[model samples]
Target: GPETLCGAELVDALQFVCGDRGFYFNKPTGYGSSSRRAPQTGIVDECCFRSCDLRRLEMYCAPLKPAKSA
Candidate 1:
């Protein structure tokens, strides 16, 4: 299960890839900050993944346990 919070894009990719496998991202529905409030500290500004990586997303995803084979 995803233990830590991550960027929105990563969440989206994870949904697109692992959603069918009982994976889900629980987040607030209310509007939140859309831009950075401070200077960048990492190599990437965002999880800006053009192509979704199931492995990576799974690394930070939560499993809803919808699968019956588990």
Candidate 2:
């Protein structure tokens, strides 16, 4: 009953990667641990590592570009 979520969540879905949102950018496509998951594609794979590891997402996704900024 106490399994809370993790990570800096100013963002959560795949659509908000650039603007402080999530890892991808297509709706109806639940990128992370939502009950349902969206299908993957070429470009989507680049953004998501296709794993349920939130920490992994955080480590790479944070400082999300201007990828050159950080």
Candidate 3:
């Protein structure tokens, strides 16, 4: 589960994604942001997954706290 908060500015499509807890990046890569799916319609629980890699997600998804902070 995503443990940190990330601004939508970093997300590729800010206009499509939405959530109060976890995020759901609606609208596929080829689709336009003009249309959006409602969060309450079973999208809020899903992660905004482009690629399901933790390292890649950390770079794009959440502002995860840095490891080994002194």
Candidate 4:
């Protein structure tokens, strides 16, 4: 699995973290269910935004990889 983003975090990944077209910068990874019954089962682990919860975030953003300097 790749580095994942969720909820409002995706917003930042789009406007701030990732450059260019946010949609173009990112790729939908997959989905994960949140849970409180178990420790570390919640999707909050990957949350990068404030006041965000498990609503409907599954896709992840891929920041462009820098090319080697010539």
TM-score of each: 0.28, 0.20, 0.19, 0.26
Q: Highest lDDT, which number?
A: 1
- Model 4, global lDDT: 0.37
Clash pairs of candidate 4? none
Residue-wise lDDT of candidate 1 within 1-70, one digit each (tens)?
2222334445455565456544444232212333444222211223442322234444334442243335
Best by TM-score: 1
lDDT of 4 by residue, 1-70 (tens): 1243443454553443334445432234334332343233133444533334433232233234332222
Give the CA lDDT, 0 to 100, for residue 19 in model 4.
45
**Cα lDDT for residue 24, candidate 4:** 37
Error of 1 at 47 (Å): 1.7
| Predicted candidate 4, C-alpha RMSD | 9.8
lDDT of 1: 0.38
Quick one: ranking by lDDT, best first? 1, 4, 2, 3
Q: Which residues of candidate 3, in runs, are more than 4 Å off?
A: 1-52, 65-70
What's the lDDT of the predicted structure labeled candidate 3?
Answer: 0.31
Error of 1 at 17 (Å): 2.0
Cα-based lDDT for every prediction: 0.38, 0.37, 0.31, 0.37
Residue-level lDDT of model 3, residues 7-55, one tens digit each, is 2222422222222333334323323353356233222223333221232
Better of 2 and 3 by lDDT: 2
